[PDB]
Every structure is written in structure tokens, then in C-alpha cells.
């Protein structure tokens, strides 16, 4: 499954869950720590915001 853009949730406007919903991958908390352990501040900022 892949996705560039798609549908978003109502309350929070983040991508939806599954490949049935054509959803995004969960960039969870441990992946955020992995990016913070590198100095990947811009990669992280575009994961979070954009």
C-alpha cells in the first residue's frame, strides 16, 4: 500500500488508518525518537506539520 495524499480525519486532520481507507502510515512515538536521535529536525518537522 502507498499513499501520497488522501482523506483526513474529522476532528484531528491527520491521515486515516488503513489501506482500505487509503490511509497513512503511523509515524509513531518511537519513530519520532529515532529521528530525534539523528539530527533530523527538518524531516521530523515535516512529518509532524506538513
Please give the residue ranges that form the binding site for another protein (CB under 8 A): 1-17, 19, 21, 23-50
Least distance CB 19 / DNA (angstroms)? 4
- Residue in 22, 44, 26 with CA at minimum distance from that of residue 35: 44
Report if residue 23 touches DNA, rule: CB under 7 A.
yes
* Residue 6 engages DNA in binding (rule: CB under 7 A): no
**CB 6, CB 15: distance < 8 Å:** yes
Among the listed ranges 5-13, 22-30, 35-43, the one in contact with DNA (CB under 7 A) is 22-30
The closest alpha carbon to 15, from 1, 33, 27, 31, belongs to 27
Amino acid at each position: 500500500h502507498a499513499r501520497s495524499t488522501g482523506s483526513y480525519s474529522l476532528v484531528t486532520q491527520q491521515p486515516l488508518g488503513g489501506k482500505a481507507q487509503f490511509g497513512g502510515q503511523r509515524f509513531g512515538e518511537m519513530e519520532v525518537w529515532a529521528l530525534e536521535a539523528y539530527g533530523a529536525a527538518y524531516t521530523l518537522q515535516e512529518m509532524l506539520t506538513v
